[PDB]
Amino acid sequence: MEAIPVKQFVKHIGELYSNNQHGFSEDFEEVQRCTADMNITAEHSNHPENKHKNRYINILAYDHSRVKLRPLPGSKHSDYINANYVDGYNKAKAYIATQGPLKSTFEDFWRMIWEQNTGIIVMITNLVEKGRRKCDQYWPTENSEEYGNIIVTLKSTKIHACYTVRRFSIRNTKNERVVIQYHYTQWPDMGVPEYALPVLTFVRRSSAARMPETGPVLVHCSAGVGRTGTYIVIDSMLQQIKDKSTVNVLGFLKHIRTQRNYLVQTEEQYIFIHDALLEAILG
Ligand code: VO4
């Protein structure tokens, strides 16, 4: 669609900041309303047998783009996980955006990873933030843990200033696959990171870890919409910039909003997307 050249984008940024960022605020208000004339169904999300599988009652997975698990013999809603396919730059279903797993969905989570042939997990939340539970620990602290038919083994860990990388082997007892978890650990309990550069490095390193041809990269935070959407837009726009030297943040964001509710949840995040791209463009 309407992509603009990097040079123009770079002037456009200053205009968005100018009058108190009234521009950014108007853009994001446009994103918020972009699906207002779109009734998108989420029937499986709202089904009673599935209610315990949602971390947040108001954060749903749209039906048309939801990831389906293969049905289990025995129930009629065992295909459900709160997770949607999301497009990336020049590729459909480049990501799976999902909530932070609950103990009750650990098996579903890892089965989904197995079935989708996912090789990369991007986690952008701490387990607990400001005293509040945000995600349950769905991986082994050391050695191995069993989640249904999938056994996960921690092979190694590197802990950087702002993010942690865990290498796992996972095996379906019906260890067969490598899964790399990139875990950003310095998102503040309030608001957005103060400097984009660390996030930028995180995105580049985690995006580069993507092998041809694995399944979608799984990206989650707590709800799987705010930091998750921000990661997705930043990663996708860096792709487009590298590829065509153009950028379409607003267009892309309005597009993926049809694929999962609330992606890029706050105006601060919408602005932080631009801080990050500008640093990548200048640096
Ligand atoms: O955990 V998020 O609120 O960034 O969706």
Swiss-Prot record:
All copies of domain Tyrosine-protein phosphatase, residue ranges: 24-280
Coiled coil regions, renumbered to chain: none
Catalytic site positions: C221 (phosphocysteine intermediate)
Entire-sequence positions represented here: 825 to 1122 of 1445
Record family assignment: Belongs to the protein-tyrosine phosphatase family. Receptor class 5 subfamily.
Tissue: Found in a variety of tissues.
Assembly notes: Monomer; active form. Homodimer; inactive form. Interacts with CNTN3, CNTN4, CNTN5 and CNTN6.
Annotated positions binding substrate: D189, C221, S222, A223, G224, V225, G226, R227, Q265
Protein name: Receptor-type tyrosine-protein phosphatase gamma
Function: Possesses tyrosine phosphatase activity.
Compartments it resides in: Membrane
Superkingdom of the source species: Eukaryota
Outcome, altering K134E: Loss of dimerization
